[PDB]
């Protein structure tokens, strides 16, 4: 959920640039650059919430998410499986978009309805934080983005 180039607030340090995501017995590490004091902070991704570091989708990201939601088979299943895995809100968006459009027509498989329902869960959770709202008006925004 942390993307290179994103800016996150690091308590006691200020604005931190996500500069890289390393692999360092071996787990996933955030490499953060605070220009203030030219400080480099490496922290295990799983621990980011404990230290008070969150990657919240900015206005750049909200656009992209809405742009991708509006944009115009074992293969397709595994691709979408992979997108939900990556925790990338843009990927989740693609999954929501493609599955929802299919659900309007041919209908989904039970397995796919589950995949879609989960992707929405993830997506509105992310939208809710991005528009600083709390999981009731986020989905409403999603539907209207979807219906239109």
């Amino acid at each position: 959920i942390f993307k290179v180039g994103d800016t996150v607030v690091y308590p006691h340090h200020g604005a931190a640039l996500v500069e890289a995501i390393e692999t360092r017995e071996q787990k996933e590490y955030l490499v953060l650059k605070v220009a203030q004091g030219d400080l480099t902070v490496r922290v295990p991704a799983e621990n980011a919430e404990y230290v008070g570091v969150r990657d919240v989708v900015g206005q750049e990201g909200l656009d992209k998410v809405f742009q991708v939601l509006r944009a115009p088979w074992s293969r397709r299943y595994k691709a979408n499986l992979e997108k939900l895995a990556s925790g990338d809100v843009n990927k989740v968006a693609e999954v929501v978009r493609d599955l929802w459009r299919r659900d309007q027509e041919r209908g989904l498989s039970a397995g796919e309805k589950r995949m879609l329902a989960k992707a929405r869960q993830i997506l509105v959770g992310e939208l809710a934080l991005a528009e600083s709202t709390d999981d009731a008006k986020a989905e409403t925004i999603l539907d209207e983005v979807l219906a239109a």
Partner: protein, 386 residues
């Protein structure tokens, strides 16, 4: 004692070593030096890591390096400036709880640079640092007469090539004392207890000696843990002594290569003097518990007027004082080494400020910059070149 004549290239090479320059590094590679380490680099390694109370947080230092000199030699002379380059180090703070690693480049002061001539320019004036002759590594026993008890006193110094001193002595009160790293005198049994000796094993080994029995009884320490804390109180007065940190401090003082080195010749001389490892190749040049105990026994037997001794598993050696006017017991300290030792003193004070700031600062707010105060390092250099 300062030298009366200096070899120029020995001194200039010593400075290149100190600053870990490219030409020192390439020359080391050409000789096939194993693990070449520069002077400043060695000091940073010596003190890393600085840990807090509980072994949760740590601060480490690495990669000393310089930007270009602030100004040309001629300009420094013509404008009465100091010919110097800014020193930087990389400092890394680690929170073991969260796994946070916080690192930054830290300015450590402007560092006076040596010239082509082997000189320094200090506020416009060109100066030459003179090397010193100091006692070479080894173990040295001596005998004196008190003023005024009429008593015959004995003492011994263990001197390394690099690292803290260890001294023992029998005073006019007929007690055996230890001075660790030139600190306050302690009953020698405190050091034995700190190394893990029970009262029983101290008596098995040293019970023959009247002054050792008297030292043990008047030693107010009960057990290994109390002994460790008391050494900590002597070495770091005013700081909260804990068990684990006292163990680490004593261990690093003498028994690990990080901060202590007898060098090969000092290691040889200690073996020879005390009768330890006689047919054996020298591998390590740290001190051992065995050395400490044999040194005490030597001093004690010397005091009772004995003339030979044999430590457990060792060979018989004569028990006597060292003439210590002999050459071979003097050693050259180069300019790079003198500056290196001065930096080390400055850093040690900086090191203490770090531990003190670790007790009060919010761990979540701590960075190397909030912990590091370079003033004693800057002051140490200013004093040296004044």
């Amino acid at each position: 004692r300062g030298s009366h004549m200096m070899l120029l290239d020995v001194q200039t090479d010593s400075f290149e070593w100190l600053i870990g320059s490219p030409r020192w590094r390439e020359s080391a590679a050409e000789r096939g030096d194993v693990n070449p380490v520069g002077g400043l680099e060695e000091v940073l390694y010596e003190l890393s890591p600085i840990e807090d109370f509980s072994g949760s947080m740590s601060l480490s230092f690495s990669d000393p390096r310089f930007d270009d000199v602030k100004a040309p030699v001629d300009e420094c002379k013509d404008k009465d400036m100091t010919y110097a380059a800014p020193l930087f180090v990389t400092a890394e703070f680690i929170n073991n709880n969260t796994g946070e690693i916080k690192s930054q480049t830290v300015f450590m002061g402007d560092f006076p640079m040596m010239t082509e001539k082997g000189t320094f320019i200090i506020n416009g004036t060109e100066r030459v640092v003179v090397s010193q002759l100091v006692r070479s590594p080894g173990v040295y026993f001596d005998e004196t007469i008190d003023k005024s008890t009429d008593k015959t006193l004995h003492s011994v110094k263990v001197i390394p090539s690099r690292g803290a001193w260890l001294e023992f002595d029998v005073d006019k009160r007929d007690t055996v004392g230890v001075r660790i790293d030139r600190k306050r005198r302690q009953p020698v049994t405190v050091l034995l207890k700190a190394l893990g000796w029970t009262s029983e094993q101290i008596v098995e080994r040293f019970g023959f000696s009247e002054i050792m029995r008297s030292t043990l009884e008047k030693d107010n320490t009960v057990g290994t843990d109390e002994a460790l804390l008391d050494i900590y109180r002597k070495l770091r007065p005013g700081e909260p002594p804990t068990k684990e940190s006292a163990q680490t401090l004593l261990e690093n003082l003498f028994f690990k290569e990080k901060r202590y080195d007898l060098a090969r010749v000092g290691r040889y001389k200690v073996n020879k003097k005390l009768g330890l490892h006689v047919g054996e190749p020298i591998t390590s040049s740290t001190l051992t518990e065995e050395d400490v105990v044999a040194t005490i026994e030597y001093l004690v037997r010397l005091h009772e007027g004995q003339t030979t001794m044999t430590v457990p598993g060792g060979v018989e050696v004569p028990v006597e004082t060292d003439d210590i006017d002999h050459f071979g017991n003097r050693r050259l300290r180069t300019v790079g080494e003198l500056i290196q030792n001065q930096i080390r003193v400055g850093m040690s004070r900086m090191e203490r400020v770090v531990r003190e700031r670790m007790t009060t600062q919010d761990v979540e707010a701590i960075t190397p910059q909030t912990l590091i105060n370079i003033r004693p390092v800057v002051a140490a250099i200013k004093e040296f070149f004044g």
